[PDB]
Amino acid sequence: ARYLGPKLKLSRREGTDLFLKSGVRAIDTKCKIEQAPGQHGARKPRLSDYGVQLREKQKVRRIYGVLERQFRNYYKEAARLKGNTGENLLALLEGRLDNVVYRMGFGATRAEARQLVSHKAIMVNGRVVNIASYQVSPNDVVSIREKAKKQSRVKAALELAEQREKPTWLEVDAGKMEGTFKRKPERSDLSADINEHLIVELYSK
Amino acid sequence: MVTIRLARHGAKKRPFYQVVVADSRNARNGRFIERVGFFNPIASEKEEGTRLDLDRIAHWVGQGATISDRVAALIKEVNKAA
Amino acid sequence: TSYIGGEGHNLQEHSVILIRGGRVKDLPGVRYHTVRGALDCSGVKDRKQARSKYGVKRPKA
Amino acid sequence: NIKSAKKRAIQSEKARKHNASRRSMMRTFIKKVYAAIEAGDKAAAQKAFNEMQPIVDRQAAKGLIHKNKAARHKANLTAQINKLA
Amino acid sequence: SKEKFERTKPHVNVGTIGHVDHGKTTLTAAITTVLAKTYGGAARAFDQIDNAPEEKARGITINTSHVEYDTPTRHYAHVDCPGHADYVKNMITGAAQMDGAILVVAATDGPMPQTREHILLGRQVGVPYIIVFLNKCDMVDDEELLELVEMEVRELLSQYDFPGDDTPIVRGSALKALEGDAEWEAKILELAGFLDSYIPEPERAIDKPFLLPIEDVFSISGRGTVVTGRVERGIIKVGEEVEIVGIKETQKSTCTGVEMFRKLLDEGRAGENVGVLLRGIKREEIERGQVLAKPGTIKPHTKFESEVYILSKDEGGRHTPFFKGYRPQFYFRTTDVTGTIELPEGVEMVMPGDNIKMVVTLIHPIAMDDGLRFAIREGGRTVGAGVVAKVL
RNA sequence: AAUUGAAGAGUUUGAUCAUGGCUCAGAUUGAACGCUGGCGGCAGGCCUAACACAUGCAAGUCGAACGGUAACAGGAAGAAGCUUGCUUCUUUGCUGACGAGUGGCGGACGGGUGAGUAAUGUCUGGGAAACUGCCUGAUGGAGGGGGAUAACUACUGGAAACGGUAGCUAAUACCGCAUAACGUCGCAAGACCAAAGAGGGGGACCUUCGGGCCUCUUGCCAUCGGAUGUGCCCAGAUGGGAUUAGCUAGUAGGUGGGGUAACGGCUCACCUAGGCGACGAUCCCUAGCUGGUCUGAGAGGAUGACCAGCCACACUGGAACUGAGACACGGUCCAGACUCCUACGGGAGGCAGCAGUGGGGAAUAUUGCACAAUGGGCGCAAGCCUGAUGCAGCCAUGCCGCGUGUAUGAAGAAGGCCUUCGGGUUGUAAAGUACUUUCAGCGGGGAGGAAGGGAGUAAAGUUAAUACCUUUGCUCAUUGACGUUACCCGCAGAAGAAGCACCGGCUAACUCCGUGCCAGCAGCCGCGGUAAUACGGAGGGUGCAAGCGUUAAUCGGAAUUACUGGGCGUAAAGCGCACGCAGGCGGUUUGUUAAGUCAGAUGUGAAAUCCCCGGGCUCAACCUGGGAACUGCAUCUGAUACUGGCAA
RNA sequence: GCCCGGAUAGCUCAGUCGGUAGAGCAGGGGAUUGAAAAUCCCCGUGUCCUUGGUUCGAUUCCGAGUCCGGGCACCA
């Protein structure tokens, strides 16, 4: 399911920062970034149109950690929704629980956030949830059970988001590893640089 | 011979029962005249638990619908006053 | 008539095999192949890359 | 086949013997009428008709004749005798 | 399935060994005949035990026929083996199951080199007991000749470690007892009571990991495939998974049927000699010689070093020495495998009657263990006899 | 709120634009094969031989219908040993019950397969010459007798299968008599037509001491209904070939007779000479059909396994019987073929029921558990039967969910690889280190699916009755195949859990070594005849993921069959030309019709499946509430511009 | 389980009925042609499938297995 491999090599391929190895230190800087996706990173590519359509597809998946069969189903749901597909797809990719937990400091890295949901530590409205792909409905909450509370990892990892931006569509309490969710994200509110446009063209064919 | 019985639909270990009006000679899920209400046996306590469109059911009783005691148990469950 | 793939086979006039579709476009009138990994027409000798085709198993050693 | 439901077989056999007998006696009185109508015996055909009336209707009441078939046997045959007489 | 087996008496494996035309099959019909006149149900005849057109035409045995009975002492299993030179392979398959062999000796000929091979193969398969029944006793009166015949049987067994001087040689007539004689039946009943005295109930180790020698395969029309063999070690019951281990690429199946000659036994413990049902296995894949084991505890061992007592022309082996590269047959009681004779530096060619040890590489892998006594046959003559010392 | 919906590329030629085929990128599948392999959830699993099949089970029930009782547990009289009432135990259908038999009911249901069938079938919508066990409403009856037979005995045939002969006895079995009506026939008159009783309780009365007698429950008979299913008719629709153009003579229709529940050539007798056919009749080949499923922007194309409806079939062909209903899967008879048993005369069997076997094949499962839930049969009921069904097993077969770990770690090592031997890469990757513990594995807790029912209990209807039966609450003991459950807890420890395809262009992603048009590659154009980003290996990288690929098959791309939406001067193609029937189309005006057309309404379009908004499994797939839709058809009422009809 | 025919130079195969392994093509060279093919000329490169003997010497005669193709028998 998971990539479970060298999660910085992905950032060197896409060229963009993905916060995969976000953890404790701010910026990576020790991987000879942008010029070495592999053994022949010296080759300035042609990067054709099919490539620019596909590189966009992989990048978004590489950020949230989704698989093709799973990611395509998110596109299938995005088409039937009202409004605009390019926006609702970014809504579903954001509505993932491990993505929600990532926006709360819990799980300094998106992978760790997936593990935290994996080990029954994450709970919504008094209901334990193991599925990291749990679709979060608007106006909910989040917290941590008494068992795996402040287990030496939640503390250190929570410090990271304290230095980050801490977006609008949600609110953290941090009194007992406490959180609370609100309305669903807007396109202008999320990521601020992505171009989902290329993705819609890819799944058309 | 008309009769009012259940249907047993849903999934494995999560039953459901379309209380229906059918001919007794059919199968459990076979040919029927009309489904009238339903029943969910796993409906402990929530917004929706059981529905029986009583008025149309009683119409078939005058016709000669032999109600099975299981269904009759539900009629005794969703009583005129209870 | 079916083309036998791989570098080296082990057939002897009877050897029961399995046929799979596909043309060769190199031999006149050949519209089939022989499955390398199925019956008697076994796997090709020492192939690492792409061993699903050519029927080599995973090397224990 | 050897089955405990073999009784239905032998019972149908036993029922057939009673059925072959009763159905045959009914038909003779009907055939008795046709022997009369061809002769022109307007009274005898009436005699044969009135004689076979209680026996043909009895078969209809005993779950053998479909109580409409027997009625039809009365009707058309009556239509013949009053046409002759 | 008919008539589920009822656990009443402890099981015993027995049967005939010996020279051609010596009434082994007639004795088999005669033994249970006297026992049919004592207890239970049996007494099959000449027409029943012999099954093939080839057999009842020239009075021979081509397939090892089996018969069952039980005295008021134990439960028994009789194994009727042939005695012809080219059918020695068959009697060895019968030798793999018998807890106690029984030598059938005609009063006329007596101890033969062919009878010598039926005895020698008994020690090399693990059987320690042989009760010798002298058949055709009603044909001899000249005892001085017959007493010299009986003592030659004992010392030949004594030559091959069977305590023959301690062995009660049973004398009697099988012909009359099979037809209903009250006189020679007790002569047959001699071996019967001695069967309850000389051959007891051995060490039935039912608490070991399951392993079973493949005797032959009998595909049941309507049920599926039934392999045959006595339980070497361990226990089986319907609802236990096993494997198909040996010669070919090893596969798996499930124990779903055990019959003690039509008698349905739920749990076939160690020593129980029956037919075992296989699930989803064809006639072709499984074969004579492999073994059924516990799910993955017996790997396909290929090579082993063995201590082999090389015989001479006087002891049944070759008459001329043979070099490095000899390719004989190796009887692993049911597993006939050809192997390489890897000679140690010191023995260039194997003289008739050597005390040596060589390393053998099998052409078909099989379950192997240190201490496995196996005889060596080639050209009709059992050319050698060894016991596994080292497994490579 | 209820379809927000359409991508191209490669390849002719020196080069271009066209025309134009071939091929590919995607989604999908009852999938098969190679490789690898952790769990779970929900579905699927003989599309090949409608080939043949051992064994077990798949359809039985009612003593509250009857004669009886062969058994098992009591009661009774008696017998025996001896603990003289502790035991043994012969008689005995007298209770509880129940084999074998008579009889009622079910066996026509449900489950399985798609051989046949191109229209006797199916779907849609109307229609009348129909029938309807069981359920139920209303109206009434429910009198009185007779003769048999099985079971059971005796003899007897046959190896058995299976009978035969003479007597015994019963009924809710059979059969008259009687009695009949808004029932049948008929113009009416008149004539004629039915049957079944049992069981519980009980004060008084009556006891030839069976019981009569009263009440209650259920059933029986007749009739009209309702409801339900089934049968039939008509219209349209319902594959390819015209290199099949004519076919048919009980055939087309009529008059009379018969037959069916029912109209009818369904079947006869005679008369008439017609009836069908280019808007494809016959004939051949193929094929179950439909709601649907797959693809598609749609229109369509293909297909129609699972769920469901309808039809046909049940070893091959044929017929009939009983029955409300079959021309009948575990029914009969006959012929045949193939197995099986035989005392050789003569018989028995039918897995296209669940499992399983052989065999066919590329390929598809366990000789599992329970009747707990639901449903069906029977029964007053409890219960008895249930391979329907509910589960479980097996297979990655599909779909969906999750894990196989996280943070940190620059000596930026080793080993490998490339090298301009400068170094880069492998690579924060690993080691080490600090944390974590989902699912497995082991030891403990623990829902829900269960409603009823049974006994007792109190009250209430009914009744002469605090009796019996019905109904409503209460209590006790309980009913779970799954099941070592869903879920929860603890435990130890990164601990058991990553492969597969590809890297010339198409199409995401590269170098080196080795083989030299050899070995080989391949979907398309092609590469390799010493320097290969294309072959084989190594390193790295790319895609996908418990799956990855290849093959087969459907659609798409294919506007390369063009209705939406193509062409014909030369690209493939205007008949050589004209006449002209069927057929199609048609100037202008007024009036009318309202057939086509348009609107609105109602009936219907089965449910589920697809779609919109929600609910419930930790979520999801899945199940599910309501709605929309089901693009259609029929009928009625209006509009009547336009087209057609009619009249001038 | 039993009974047959076969394993021969790289390939395709003849020869035995105890005498020291052959043929076609192959591969290479020469002659040759504007080039090629072809033709003629020269040779086994063999554990006669493996293994033991009877023997002066075994492809051979046999006894036995290993593999391949084909046929038949027994049915826990």
Ligand SMILES: Nc1nc2c(ncn2[C@@H]2O[C@H](COP(=O)(O)OP(=O)(O)CP(=O)(O)O)[C@@H](O)[C@H]2O)c(=O)[nH]1
């Ligand atoms: N006089 C006598 N003759 C006897 C006796 N027992 C057997 N015979 C005969 O001996 C002969 C061998 O019978 P068989 O049973 O075939 O022997 P086998 O042991 O199977 C032989 P093969 O070795 O070929 O299979 C038959 O003729 C049998 O009747 C006995 O006690 N006395």
